[model samples]
Target chain A: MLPGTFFEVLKNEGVVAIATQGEDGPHLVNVWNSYLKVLDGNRIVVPVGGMHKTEANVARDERVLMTLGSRKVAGRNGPGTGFLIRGSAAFRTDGPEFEAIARFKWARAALVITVVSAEQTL
Target chain B: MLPGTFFEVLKNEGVVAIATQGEDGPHLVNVWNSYLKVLDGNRIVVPVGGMHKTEANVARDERVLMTLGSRKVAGRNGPGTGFLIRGSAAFRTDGPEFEAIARFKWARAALVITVVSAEQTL
Candidate 1:
């Protein structure tokens, strides 16, 4: 069964995890301590830099696997929460209009990731 | 190694995927049509309904697997790009403040899935 409490915890506190593949294979990173913006009932938008490991991986395969949780509890599992996302990568350019929003939350330039598939693990 | 092109593709187009778990267990759904928002260099924010299959899965497991692509090519692979996301689910209540953004994008309610770990496939 789905753990309703899990989503509740994320809603109240936050989420974090490690994204992995190869080199592009599996680049694990964290992204939870930021503002979240929703566009639809299922679609999600995220800001990212153009030159990151995860970005590079998406460039070649377009397939992605991500984990969610805090660094303090990278692998422990319980203390933190984690998930794997496998989807193609999409970005918003650094045009004046797009820059406005990207700059709002990020210091440097940023890209947006449209999350399609998402699920929890054991 | 991480595929640089993969990220590039994500940077160029948009991502899509089917999330799985087991009921809460492995529900295949889509989430591509929405407004793109960014928070930081890696974190992302999305709007999701409270009573969907993805949400129910997050409720119990907190782990999710997703695919990225257009419905036209749900499982075909090439025409549409896809990925899997394994992360915990987070939601913003329908209060007046959050409701502003939620209402802006969705017709009813919404939530965000913070992506931590990300990777591409074969």
Candidate 2:
């Protein structure tokens, strides 16, 4: 489950880094304006548009990780608050969940990830 | 090889999202105060210290991806200067290269990644 501070970090104007495993190796994307909803404390839903490597990788392998942080929260060394989340992803192309996010014409799928662990970055 | 603009982003105060694959799947970490240098046009070197999941995953799988961008450079959608780099990582514990970063007592290795492809994120 996510800590209360985790949601607090998400509330800020920041970026989330989405990492997926591809055939050759790891793939990372910066999700800026995408919609991210807390399905629950232990889960999150991210809407994705267009045909991207991230979506294809999730389709092949359920494994996914997302890291969020901001430089605003100063720490001893640098940024203070950082959250790294490890989870498994499920792809939904159609349905209430999909339609809820598929508002754009190019919107394709919603990625639902169940958090297995959340660690604070140093 | 990396694009000319790629080096430009590295010069900024932007944070990099480094992704590595582990047995569970993908793992992500943000490199802040750590040193990142472009060994050449196609390779980057990042110093690591302490025992962390990221180092362990990089040891197990050489594959890595680093994504970097900033809100300063605006595009029609959002950020304009996003760069997604896919590459392979090598762990160096002892050497001139390693010594350049291993000055820190807790430092264990220097990760050198050779870029295979650099993509622009939407």
Candidate 3:
């Protein structure tokens, strides 16, 4: 399960960095809440538009990682607090996951990640 | 060589997202100007603190990626504009690069990445 603070960060409008392995190296991209949401305690949904390298890399490698920074927290570690999340991804084009983000102008597919581990990296 | 806009963003205090390949998956982390700098037209210097998974993964795989978001841009692009940078990294514990960022409270090593490709991802 994720910490309450984790959910709090995701709820706000902040950029999340996503990492995926490409054939030559690792790829990184900045995603927003419009493309991301928590499915359950340990699951996350990210809608992919643009059919960009991020989506291509995820298809080749299921493993992925994400990080998000927090702007405000009471008595927390510090400002710019962030989290490092590791998980496995599953891609879908037509399903409930896709429907959830179908409204996005560029959402071509849905990427769902199952959280395997998470850490506070402030 | 990097565009003027790239340097402009680096000079500011915005956060940069770094990606590295781990044995099992890719790792993502949010680094700041305190931990990063542009050495030249195509070189970036990131001081590694905590010797965390990011450092470990970079050691195993020299290939890395970085992304940064911009809050302000002219009619050139929309707000929340960002860049996706691809490069090769070299780790250094003792050198001018390391010495440059030694003042950082937690800097343990210097990560110098040679930029290979860059793209605007708004």
Candidate 4:
């Protein structure tokens, strides 16, 4: 299960970081917490906008890692909570997953991530 | 020069993501915007707490990528701005770089990154 605190972090506005390996090696990208939509309890769908390289990378390698946090949540020693999620991703252009963010005029596809592990790091 | 807006993003509170390639593959980690300290505009020094795997990754591959964003900043189509930074990192246990975060009792080393390219993606 995605920790209840992870949901709380998503409720607030913050940055989401995604890492992928491409032909060019490791690459990093950013999205907003608001862009995340949960499917089932472990899968997450994100709207794709201007992620050409990210899409290319995913096509070659589905492995992905994501980390996000919110200062609003209580931490072990502070006021912030952070999570590290290891997952595999696929871009959907025509499916229920794609429709999740298809309403956005700029969204060309949906980035679907199936969670393998989720760890609270902060 | 690192974009002026990048400094603006750092001034505010947000999440900063770092990406590295490990023996296991791509890895992602998170830190607070407040944790970053810039040096001479091109290098970034971060305090190390428990980044065992990250440190190991850096030793094998110096390449690193980081993405950070802040909703407070103005974007092309919204109120948020994001930056992707490509760099090479080195861990210092005792040196001027290490002293950058030596004040922190939890800091075991300094993760110093030299910026090769910094692009504003949002």
Residue-wise lDDT of candidate 4 within B1-122, one digit each (tens)? 68788999999889888888877568788778988889995999989888889888988989999888899999888788989999999999997888888668898888999999998898
Give candidate 3 regions above 4 Å deviation. Answer: A11-13, A73-76, B11-14, B74-77
Range of the 10 consecutive residues with the lowest summed lDDT in candidate 3 chain B:
B69-78
Please give, as one word, the docking class of candidate 1: incorrect
A best-first ranking of the candidates according to their TM-score comes to 4, 3, 2, 1
What's model 2's lDDT at B14?
A: 47
Worst 10 residues of 3 chain A by lDDT: A69-78
Cα lDDT tens digits for candidate 4, A11-104: 9999999888877568888789998999885789998987899889989889998999999999888899989998999999898988878887
Tens digit of lDDT per residue, candidate 2, span B56-78?
A: 88778777888876555654475
Who wins the lDDT comparison? Answer: 4
TM-score of 2: 0.79
Backbone-clash count (model 3): 0
lDDT of 3 at A105: 67
- Each model's TM-score for chain A is 0.55, 0.82, 0.86, 0.95
Estimate, for each residue in A1-122, the C-alpha lDDT of model 2 and write its tens digit: 78776776666555578888888777787765235777644768777775377888988988788887655565446555677788888878887667656555666687778899988765
Question: Which TM-score value belongs to model 3?
Answer: 0.85
Q: What are the clashing pairs of model 2? A: none
For candidate 1, the per-residue lDDT at A8 reads 42
The weakest ten consecutive residues by lDDT in model 4 chain A span A22-31
Candidate 1 chain B, run of 10 with poorest lDDT: B67-76
TM-score of the second chain of model 3 compared to its true counterpart: 0.86
Better of 3 and 4 by TM-score: 4
